[PDB]
Design a protein around this motif. Structure first.
Motif, short mmCIF file in Angstrom:
data_model
loop_
_atom_site.label_atom_id
_atom_site.label_comp_id
_atom_site.label_asym_id
_atom_site.label_seq_id
_atom_site.Cartn_x
_atom_site.Cartn_y
_atom_site.Cartn_z
N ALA B 8 -8.10 0.18 0.31
CA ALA B 8 -6.59 0.41 0.67
C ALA B 8 -6.35 0.29 1.90
O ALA B 8 -5.49 -0.29 2.63
N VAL B 9 -7.50 0.81 3.07
CA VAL B 9 -7.17 0.40 4.51
C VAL B 9 -7.28 -1.03 4.89
O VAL B 9 -6.81 -1.48 5.70
N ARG B 12 -4.22 -2.56 3.58
CA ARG B 12 -3.21 -2.24 4.66
C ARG B 12 -3.16 -3.13 6.00
O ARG B 12 -1.99 -3.70 6.12
N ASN B 30 -4.99 1.16 12.32
CA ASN B 30 -5.68 0.58 11.10
C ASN B 30 -6.86 -0.25 11.68
O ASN B 30 -8.08 0.34 11.06
#
Lengths: 125, 756
Positions: B8-9, B12, B30
Motif C-alpha cells: 500500500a505505501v 501510494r 512517502n
C-alpha cells in the motif's frame, strides 16, 4: 504483562478504527507509533485492525502530521517482523473488543435474561 | 498483514508520481518512508520500485523516473540478489538535459547496487565480453559506473586482458574508454587502496592489457584513443615506472612519445591533445598518493606550457583537472598567470578553487590561497562590472560571474581573510540580486549572501561592521523590492533569521528597519499568495529582533501576522485595520502604495494587484491621520467609473473594499466626504440634480450598509465620531425623486435595508 500491552494496544487501535475526527486520529496514531516501538512483540495483534484503515490513510491521506505516525508504525512493524497473533486476545476472552466498540440482540439477550434472573434470584429474596 | 501495507505505501508512492504543496510533502514523506522501510524489507520496496519503473518506462515522465531512481539510489545506499539482477539491473541499463540527469541518477543507482551486487554486474559484463568475442557495446559501458575496489579492478583487468584480443575493434574501443573511467572510480572512492598500491598480479594484468592495447594502436586516431588508458595501466605498474626511469621498451617509447607530443615536436594535434589528457590524468593520479612524482616532474612543465599559454590558448574540465592537480602537488606560477589573461583562465581558476573546497589528509586545504584574496576580489569586481555593462564575450563573463558567486558560496572566508573590502564584496553581490536577465546568478548571489550572513562569516567581515554593512544591504534590497521578488523575499527571511542569530550572540539601521517595514507591508498586497505568506513570516523575525534588542508599537499585530487568495487578502486587510500606531515605515508604505496605485489607476482607466493595493490602502490608511484625503476623493470618483471594459469590476471592488475593508479611523473622513459629495447633488433651492449621481447614491447606500453590517472590534468608537444625519437625509431626498422603474425601486428597497 503482554495481556495488558495487548489490551491497551487494542483499545488505541479500536479508537483509530472508528473515529472520524482527523484531530483524534493525530493523537491516537502518535501513541500507536511509540507503542509499536515500545511493544513490538505484541504489536502484531493489532495489525488486522489497523490494516484496513492504514491502507485507507496511506492511499488517500495528505496530512503530514497524521502520516508521520502511520509511516512510523509501518517502519516499526517491518523493522520488527510472530509471538502473538490477533487470536491471542481470544485466549483470555477479548476478540470482541474491537467488535463491540464499533458503530451501533437475540443471543446476548437470552444470556442477559438468565443473568438478570440469576441476579434477582441470588440477591433478591 | 505487514506485506499488504508495504505494498500500500508502494502503491501510494506510484499514484503520487507526476506522470499520474500537499502532494509534494506527501510524495517526499512517502519516499522517505519507503527508504526507511527498505532499510529493513529491502526486496519488497525495491521490487515495487522496479515494477513501477517498468510500468512508467512502458517533463512529468522524467520527474517521475528521477523520483523513482533517487528513491532506488537512497534505498540501495541504505542496503543492509535474484530480482536485483534479473529485474532491476536491466531497467537501470535501459536508462544508461533530463537524459543526462537520468543517466547520472541511474549511474548512482548502479553504483549503489554494484557495491553489494558486484559479481552479478560483472557476470553480465563478462557475458557480453564473451558474446563480443564470437557489435553492441552498451553493457561494457556499465564498467564506467560500477563501484570498484582493488580486488574488483584486478578482476576487471584480468577478464579484459584474456578476452581483449578476441574482441572486435569497436568493442575494444568501448572497453578502453570504459576501463579509464573504471580506474578513476576506484581511486576516487578508495584513495587508501590506491595509496597502498605504491606502498604484482594487478601489475601483470595492467602490463598484459597495456601491451594488448598498444598492439591495437595501429593509427594516429587509435593512439590518441588509447593513450589515456595506457598511462593509467602504466600507473598501475610502479616497478615498471621505476625501471623505465633509468620487455619495458614499448612503455619507455610511449612515455617518450607523450613527452614529444607535449613539447610540440609531434606534428599531430590529436596526439598532443590526447597527451594533454593522459598527462593530466597522471598528475591527478599522483595527488592520490613515490617514483610517480619523478614522472610528473618530467612532464608537468610542458603540460603547464600546453594548457596555460595565454599567447596560444588550448582547445575547460581538462584544464581544471590540471590546475587542481598542480595545486595539490605543490600549493603558483600558472596560478599567477590565471589571476592576471584570458577569461577562460579566470574561469578555470575559479572553478578549480570551487572544486578544491567542495571535493585527503595530505591534500592542501584552500587556506594557502588566502594570500590571493585581493586579486580574487579585484577579479570579482571587474567581472561584475563587465557583466552588468554588457555577445560571446558578454556570455562568457556571465558564466565566470556565476562561478565566482558559487566560489563565494563555497567559501567566503578566503575573500575576507587577506583584507571596505567586505562592504564592496557584499554590495556587488547585492547588486546582482535584482537582475531579471540573470536568474541563475541572482539565486546564487542570494545563497552566497546567506552564507556570508552566517555567524562565522560575519566575524570575519565586528558588530559596528555588521550593523553598517548588513543594514546597507537590507536598505538597498528593500529599496529595490519597493520599486522574482518572492524568492528574494524568502531569502530576506533567512537573512533576518541570520541577523537575529547574530544579535542573539551580541543612522542606516533606522533607515534599513524602516525600508524593511515598508517592503513587508507592500508585499501584503502582492498578487502572489506565496509572497504574502512569506512577508507575514518576516514580521515574526522583525519581532524577534526587537525582543533581542529590548531584552538587554505594532508588535502584537505583527505577531498576529506571524500566526497566519481572496480569503488570505481578507485576513490581511482585517489585520491591517488593527494597526493603530503610526510608524515611518507604515506611513511610507501607504504613501508609496498610494503613488503606485494612482499610476496603476491611470493605466487601468494587473487588475487583481490594483484591487489588492486598493484594499491595503483602505485598511491601513488610519495611521496617516492631505494624501489620504486625495485617495478617498479618488475612490469616491471611482465608484462611478464609467469604463466600458473594467468599470463594473472597479465599481464592485471599490464598493466591496470601502464597505468591508476601510479603516475604522477613516469612517469620519468617509462620511464627511460622502456627505459633501451628496450635498452637491442639490441646488440652492434644495431641488435634486438628477446617471452619475444616481450611480454614486446606489454605491453609497451599499457601502454604508456594508460598513454598518461590519462588526470589526473598535468600529463602534469611530462610528460615533462623525454625524450621518445630513447625508442620510440627502440620500433619501435624492432617492425620492427617482421614478417608479425597476432599478429605482431596487434602489428604494436597498435604502430601506440600509436604514434598518
Amino acid at each position: 504483562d503482554p495481556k495488558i500491552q495487548a489490551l491497551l494496544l487494542t483499545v488505541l487501535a479500536t479508537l483509530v478504527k472508528y473515529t472520524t475526527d482527523e484531530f483524534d486520529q493525530r493523537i491516537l496514531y502518535e501513541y500507536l507509533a511509540e507503542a509499536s516501538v515500545v511493544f513490538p512483540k505484541v504489536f502484531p495483534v493489532v495489525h488486522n485492525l489497523l490494516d484496513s484503515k492504514i491502507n485507507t490513510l496511506l492511499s488517500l491521506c495528505q496530512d503530514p502530521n497524521l502520516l508521520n505516525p502511520i509511516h512510523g508504525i509501518v517502519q516499526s512493524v517491518v523493522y520488527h517482523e510472530p509471538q502473538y497473533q490477533t487470536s491471542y486476545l481470544q485466549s483470555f476472552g477479548f476478540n470482541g473488543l474491537w467488535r463491540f466498540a464499533g458503530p451501533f440482540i437475540p443471543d446476548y439477550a437470552e444470556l442477559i435474561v438468565k443473568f438478570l434472573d440469576a441476579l434477582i434470584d441470588t440477591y433478591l429474596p | 498483514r505487514p506485506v499488504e501495507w508495504v505494498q500500500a505505501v508502494v502503491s501510494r508512492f506510484d499514484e503520487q508520481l507526476p506522470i499520474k504543496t500537499h502532494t509534494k510533502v506527501s510524495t517526499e514523506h512517502n519516499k522517505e518512508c519507503l527508504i526507511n522501510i527498505s532499510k529493513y524489507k529491502f526486496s519488497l520496496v525495491i521490487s515495487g520500485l522496479t515494477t513501477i519503473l517498468k510500468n512508467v518506462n512502458n517533463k512529468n515522465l522524467y520527474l517521475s523516473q528521477l523520483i523513482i531512481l533517487d528513491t532506488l539510489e537512497k534505498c540501495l545506499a541504505g542496503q543492509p540478489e535474484t530480482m536485483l539482477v534479473k529485474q532491476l539491473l536491466p531497467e537501470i541499463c535501459h536508462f544508461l538535459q533530463h537524459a543526462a540527469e537520468l543517466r547520472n541518477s541511474a549511474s548512482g543507482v548502479l553504483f549503489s547496487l554494484s557495491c553489494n551486487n558486484f559479481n552479478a554486474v560483472f557476470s553480465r559484463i563478462s557475458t557480453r565480453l564473451q558474446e563480443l568475442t564470437v557489435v553492441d557495446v552498451h553493457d561494457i559501458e556499465l564498467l564506467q559506473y560500477i563501484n570498484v575496489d582493488c580486488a574488483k579492478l584486478k578482476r576487471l583487468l584480468k577478464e579484459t586482458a584474456f578476452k581483449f584480443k578476441a574482441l572486435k575493434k569497436v568493442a575494444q574501443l568501448a572497453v578502453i574508454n570504459s576501463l579509464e573511467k573504471a580506474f578513476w572510480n576506484w581511486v576516487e572512492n578508495y584513495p587508501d587502496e590506491f595509496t597502498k598500491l605504491y606502498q604484482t598480479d594487478m601489475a601483470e594484468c595492467a602490463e598484459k592489457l597495456f601491451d594488448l592495447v598498444d598492439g591495437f594502436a595501429e593509427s594516429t586516431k587509435r593512439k590518441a584513443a588509447v593513450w589515456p588508458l595506457q598511462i593509467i595501466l602504466l600507473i598501475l605498474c610502479p616497478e615498471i615506472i621505476q625501471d623505465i626511469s633509468k620487455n619495458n621498451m614499448n612503455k619507455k617509447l610511449f612515455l617518450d612519445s607523450l613527452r614529444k607530443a607535449l613539447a610540440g615536436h609531434g606534428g599531430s594535434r590529436q596526439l598532443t591533445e590526447s597527451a594533454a589528457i593522459a598527462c593530466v590524468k597522471l598528475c591527478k593520479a599522483s595527488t592520490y598518493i613515490s617514483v610517480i612524482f619523478l614522472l610528473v616532474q618530467s612532464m608537468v612543465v610542458d603540460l603547464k606550457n600546453l594548457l596555460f599559454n595565454p599567447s596560444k590558448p588550448f582547445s575547460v574540465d581538462l584544464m581544471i583537472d590540471c590546475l587542481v592537480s598542480c595545486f595539490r602537488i605543490s600549493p603558483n606560477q600558472h596560478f599567477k598567470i590565471c589571476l592576471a589573461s584570458p577569461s577562460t583562465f579566470h574561469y578555470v581558476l575559479v572553478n578549480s578553487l570551487h572544486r578544491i573546497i567542495t571535493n585527503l589528509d595530505w591534500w592542501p586545504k584552500i587556506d594557502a590561497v588566502y594570500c590571493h584574496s585581493v586579486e580574487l576580489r579585484n577579479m570579482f569586481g571587474e567581472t561584475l562590472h563587465k557583466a552588468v555593462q554588457g555577445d560571446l564575450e558578454t556570455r562568457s563573463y556571465k558564466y565566470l560571474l556565476l562561478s565566482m558567486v558559487k566560489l563565494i558560496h563555497a567559501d567566503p572566508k578566503l575573500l575576507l581573510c587577506n583584507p571596505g573590502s567586505t562592504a564592496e564584496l557584499i554590495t556587488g553581490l547585492v547588486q546582482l540580486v535584482p537582475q531579471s536577465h540573470m536568474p541563475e546568478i541572482a539565486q546564487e548571489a542570494m545563497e552566497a549572501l546567506l552564507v556570508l550572513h552566517q555567524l562565522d562569516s560575519i566575524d570575519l567581515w565586528p558588530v559596528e561592521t555588521f550593523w553598517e554593512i548588513s543594514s546597507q544591504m537590507l536598505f538597498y534590497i528593500c529599496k529595490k523590492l519597493t520599486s522574482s521578488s518572492t524568492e528574494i523575499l524568502k531569502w530576506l527571511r533567512e537573512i533576518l533569521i541570520c541577523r537575529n542569530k547574530f544579535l542573539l550572540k551580541n543612522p542606516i539601521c533606522r533607515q534599513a528597519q524602516t525600508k524593511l517595514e515598508v517592503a513587508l507591508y507592500m508585499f501584503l498586497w502582492n498578487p502572489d499568495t506565496e509572497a504574502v505568506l512569506v512577508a507575514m513570516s518576516c514580521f515574526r523575525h522583525l519581532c524577534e529582533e526587537a525582543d533581542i534588542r529590548c531584552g538587554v508599537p505594532n508588535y502584537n499585530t505583527f505577531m498576529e501576522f506571524a500566526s497566519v487568495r481572496a480569503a488570505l487578502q481578507k485576513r490581511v486587510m482585517a489585520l491591517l485595520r488593527r494597526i493603530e500606531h503610526p510608524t515611518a515605515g507604515n506611513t511610507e508604505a501607504w504613501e508609496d502604495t498610494h503613488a503606485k496605485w494612482e499610476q496603476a489607476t491611470k493605466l487601468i482607466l494587473s487588475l487583481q494587484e490594483w484591487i489588492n493595493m486598493t484594499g491595503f490602502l483602505c485598511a491601513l490608511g488610519g495611521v496617516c491621520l492631505t494624501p489620504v484625503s486625495k485617495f478617498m476623493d479618488r475612490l469616491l470618483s471611482l465608484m462611478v467609473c464609467n469604463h466600458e471594459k473594467v468599470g463594473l469590476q472597479i465599481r464592485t471592488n471599490v464598493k466591496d473594499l470601502v464597505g468591508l475593508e476601510l479603516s475604522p479611523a477613516l469612517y469620519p473622513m468617509l462620511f464627511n466626504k460622502l456627505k459633501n459629495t451628496i450635498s452637491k447633488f442639490f441646488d440652492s433651492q434644495g431641488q435634486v440634480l438628477l446617471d452619475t449621481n444616481t450611480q454614486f447614491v446606489e454605491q453609497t447606500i451599499a457601502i454604508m450598509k456594508n460598513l454598518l453590517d461590519n462588526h470589526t472590534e473598535g468600529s463602534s468608537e469611530h462610528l460615533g465620531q462623525a454625524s450621518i444625519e445630513t447625508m442620510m437625509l440627502n440620500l433619501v431626498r435624492y432617492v425620492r425623486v427617482l421614478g417608479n422603474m425597476v432599478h429605482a425601486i431596487q434602489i428604494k428597497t436597498k435604502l430601506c435595508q440600509l436604514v434598518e
